Amino acid sequence: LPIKSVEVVNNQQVPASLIKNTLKLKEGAKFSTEALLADFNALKETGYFEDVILQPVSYDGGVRIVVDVVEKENVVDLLKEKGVAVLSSVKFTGNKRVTTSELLDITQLKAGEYFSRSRVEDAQRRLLATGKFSEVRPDAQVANGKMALSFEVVENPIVKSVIITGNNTIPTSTIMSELTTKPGSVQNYNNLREDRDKILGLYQAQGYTLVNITDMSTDENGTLHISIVEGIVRRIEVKKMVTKQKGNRRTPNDDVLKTKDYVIDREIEIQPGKIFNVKEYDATVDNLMRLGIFKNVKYEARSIPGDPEGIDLILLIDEDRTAELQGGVAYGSETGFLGTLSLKDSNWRGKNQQFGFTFEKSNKNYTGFALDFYDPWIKDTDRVSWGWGAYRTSYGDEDSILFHEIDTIGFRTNIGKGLGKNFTLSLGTKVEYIKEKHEDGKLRQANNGKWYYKEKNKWREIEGVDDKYWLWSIYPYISYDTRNNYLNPTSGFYGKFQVEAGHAGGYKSGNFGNATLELRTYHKGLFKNNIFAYKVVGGVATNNTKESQKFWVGGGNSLRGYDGGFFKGSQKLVATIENRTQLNDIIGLVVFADAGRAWKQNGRDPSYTRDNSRFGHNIGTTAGVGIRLNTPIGPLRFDFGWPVGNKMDDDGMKFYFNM
């Protein structure tokens, strides 16, 4: 609810101007448990009051923050605004103290005011701060106007022994060493309170954030009967985090999690019988975040009746998105059906399996199919991956005479086993049916059956025209992953290395080889949400590989600022550096600079006129700005690069559309 007016009461002398400057709950603000929690912490830390009962009141359909203050007596020396700023006896001399010097100096006659015993209640509070008393009873003997104000006090006996029971994790000697109110000193109520706070803090530091105190008593014999309860997870349950789901109720379908129970169970690191090591919880939440299908996870401790140490820890889980269907179609003269539709389902069947159908079409005779299935972990297995993806690509390249049209049918399969949570070894095979087509009207075949190309009025024999051939290949690859999140990684390392060697038919039937190394890393940049990202792609291939399967450099995937396939060859190395900035939750500003070039083509098609030797030379460079906006309907990318340095191509702006 919003706020209509902040009407503060009881703030009779503590400045309304000062508090309204300090308080951030102005009119029209938002009401949230975290918001008022932070506000309560802020005003408590400010020190403009000792005790506050800030009760928000509903008013005019909004919230009226009513703050009930109990100000201290030691901030008036600021002199830049300030708080709350005939009697003859105080009577009842004490035993341990004289309660005349102490009172009349620290508390009485300055804060005692000789009457109005609210600051005298504060006086007994500071006596508990010195702890030298236990209970103070102000009995005002007002006679004929004058008052005696007898202050019947109870004095704390010195502690004879300090006994800790049920610690069971931290040795009692260290606990006693941390203790401030040692035996032989007077029992001290507020020092006892701060000592318990420090004990809790020490337990927090040693890795146990779920320990309470229960009892902190001292009997008449001056025996500080200290009690500490550890808190041992007896049962850990998982239910979805029911946040402010506007427009939705707590229906049985809403609160149930589509993801199966075993997926969450195999990821939890907290184990029963252990005292809630917060590092274990941090590891569990890190794993759950790295799973990708979640956005936020919180824990909650609930007591089990009849079991003091028992804690029924319950995990809260947020689901982001399982099914998606995004598509965009442009048509009508000029180009063709420029359709880019997807059916990504990255929680298909609730088993974390990624399942998706992708269709793409463009003006440059591009057609794409992809039925990708991937299981990062088979149900009840020892971390063994699985998946298969069938793809068809009717790629067209009008700039190549011999390879005007390229058809592809592929059915790949990859299975992998993980040597830990960061090393992944996998073997993946595929089968391809490729049909190559030449440019009609540019290649002439004579009656002998051979093909000739006319350059400066002479015929050159060109072979491999209209090539149709199968293509079988396998590759064992190892990958190293440390990214925190797959969708929007912020810090980590990602190295992939595959060695490919397969058999191909058609022209020059034989067995070809291939290798590829790709490194991706991230680290923190200039400021908040500024992430520096580095990607270097490397790969070599034997000359026996088919021309269509040779490495391509260009486009929005590898090298911006140049057309697709600007560089071709059997040796490719592309390095890219990006600076992504997350200004909000729906847009992202990215500045990128990339460089790379393929080498050693030695191909038949004379279309490639930039065949350059000397690996590591003539490396084209590009840079530009990019927009990575997180639309409510799905991720989307925009890229604009300027070809800089050596300007082999005279083109300027470049546009790219992708997810």
Epitope: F31, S58, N212, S217, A301, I311
Partner: antibody
Framework: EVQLVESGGGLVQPGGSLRLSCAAS????????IHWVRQAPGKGLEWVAS????????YYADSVKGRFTISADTSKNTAYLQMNSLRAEDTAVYYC????????????????????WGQGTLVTVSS | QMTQSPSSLSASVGDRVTITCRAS??????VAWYQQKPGKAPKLLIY???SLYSGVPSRFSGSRSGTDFTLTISSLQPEDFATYYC?????????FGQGTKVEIKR
């Protein structure tokens, strides 16, 4: 095994005084809340006072702003409610009830409901 | 604030009964009502929208309807005919409802 027993009740005249005691039997008052409620005969229940230990907050509901005091010491694991200047409506039973927040971490002292209720004591103010 | 409820209600064994409880507070308001047996002492049976873990025969349940809180008790039982209260928790202000009585209809 947790239960509470009330004692110190008795018979007084208007303007009199008393001291009501509630003793814990298995939990420690240093962490629990101990709430006092009363039920006038043939009428509903009405909150009186509550002393949250572990926080040192002791404020009384409506009719006890200056009349009675509730003080609890953990030495004898009991809570003491003072009585003075009692009036006609004070003739009722008195229940001491522990308040329990569903969270195990005992830094969350919000009441969230009273479960363990004592036996009750009858106090009559009639002259 | 007053948290008024309908004082007199009559039902029968096996019937489904409801009891509204008006209120006026913020979002952080939580209610908890007790089946006060007419002789000994009240007993908690709901926290804010969920029942107490130990004592409930899976009958008493309820939720919040705006500023009104209701109970959906299952088929009535001979031992459940008692006085049922209502309460709401603001920032250190325990308010109790006027209370309702449940008895047979004949």
């Amino acid at each position: 095994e947790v239960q509470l027993v009330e004692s110190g009740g008795g018979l007084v005249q208007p303007g009199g005084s008393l001291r009501l005691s509630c003793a814990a039997s298995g939990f420690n008052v240093y962490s629990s809340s101990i709430h006092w409620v009363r039920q006038a005969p043939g009428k509903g229940l009405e909150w009186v006072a509550s002393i949250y230990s572990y926080y040192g907050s002791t404020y009384y509901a409506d009719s006890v702003k200056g009349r009675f005091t509730i003080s609890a010491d953990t030495s004898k694991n009991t809570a003491y409610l003072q009585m003075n200047s009692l009036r006609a409506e004070d003739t009722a039973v008195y229940y001491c009830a522990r308040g329990y927040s569903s969270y195990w971490l005992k830094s969350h002292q919000w009441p969230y409901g009273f479960d363990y209720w004592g036996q009750g004591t009858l106090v009559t103010v009639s002259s | 604030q007053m948290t008024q409820s309908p004082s007199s209600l009559s039902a029968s064994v096996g019937d489904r009964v409801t009891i509204t409880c008006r209120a006026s507070q913020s979002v952080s308001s939580a209610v908890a009502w007790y089946q006060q047996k007419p002789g000994k002492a009240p007993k908690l049976l709901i926290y804010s929208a969920s029942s107490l873990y130990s004592g409930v025969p899976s009958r008493f349940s309820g939720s919040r309807s705006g500023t009104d809180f209701t109970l959906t008790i299952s088929s009535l039982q001979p031992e459940d005919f008692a006085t049922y209260y209502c309460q709401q928790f603001s920032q250190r202000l325990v308010t109790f409802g006027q209370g309702t009585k449940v008895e047979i209809k004949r």
